[model samples]
Target: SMSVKKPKRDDSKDLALCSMILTEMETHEDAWPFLLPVNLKLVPGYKKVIKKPMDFSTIREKLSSGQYPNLETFALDVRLVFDNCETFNEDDSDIGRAGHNMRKYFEKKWTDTFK
Candidate 1:
């Protein structure tokens, strides 16, 4: 199931059920509206989540090896994935924490497509 991607819950009926949940999900998280949006693009006009310590580029390079990760491994921070977790990172590093930091829903969402 790692090869699948889900639409970003655009159904108004669901949004109508709870209007706040739409933007509520966006809290300056790294990959929030990008890979998960299914529609939200980081265009050059609107003020989307404009600033972050990093971006989905981390995830992109991680997956570039074609080495798909299962759920737990996917949740790992990118720094840890690259480091194998000997240490998180130097405190001065931009992403001081290592491993896959994305949330857990990605497995259920995109696993069907990647695996």
Candidate 2:
């Protein structure tokens, strides 16, 4: 007789993948600027420019709390961290350079992990 199997949700696998990538991102040298939310007082006009701010810490919270439904949403927030940096900083500046590096690293990891 043939047996039938129920389909399983992939949420746990995706969550693990997201968690692994986030660890690497947190340890990266250029992760300083993206580790925490930008201080509005220190960097005036940041709120005005970056309407949607993102940071590693916030991502961690979202991940641990099961706020993200899938890997794509997690990746979207990671990308947002870099995009906000680029918009607020110059290409040649330290923060800008770090953002570029972090983005490259993330994209590579994303492809290697899922693609």
Candidate 3:
């Protein structure tokens, strides 16, 4: 008899899942602050504090261009958006609260889908 092995999920499937999760995040009510990159001109210290800036628009571009080779890296950038937000804004602030909400939403979706 042949051995039974677990089937490996293909890269395309992972990418598709990433796309679906991203779409949901983009449409989320708390997505406003994360829709685009922070304006360095308006937020002067942003460039200094958050060395790596990420946003939904950038993630979408990367996904569309097939720049993400794996789900881990894609997820990395997604988490970075929230990490940067928390670093730059106080937790009680409007934008900061939105980031927390978005993070919670993404984590729940990610766990439900991947775990």
| Candidate maximizing TM-score | 3
Instruction: List the lowest-lDDT window of 10 residues for candidate 2.
Output: 1-10
lDDT of 2 by residue, 1-115 (tens): 2586678655658888889999999999999999999998888899888999899999999999989988889999999998998898999999989999999999999999988
Index of the highest-lDDT prediction: 3
Report the lDDT of model 3 for residue 4: 72
Q: Quote each prediction's TM-score.
A: 0.22, 0.89, 0.90
Ranked candidates (lDDT, high to low)? 3, 2, 1
Distance from true location, Cα of 115 in model 1, Å: 15
Off by over 4 Å in 1: 1-54, 78-115
Off by over 4 Å in 3: 1-7
TM-score, prediction 2 = 0.89
Pitting candidate 1 against candidate 3, the one with the higher lDDT is 3
lDDT (CA) per prediction: 0.35, 0.92, 0.93
Instruction: Give lDDT tens digits, candidate 3, residues 1-115.
Output: 2797678665557878899999999999889999998998998899898899999999999999989988889999999999999998999999999999999999999999888
After superposition, the stretches of candidate 2 with alpha carbons farther than 4 Å from their true spots are: 1-11
**Which candidate do you rate higher for lDDT, 1 or 2?**
2
Greater-TM-score candidate between 1 and 2: 2
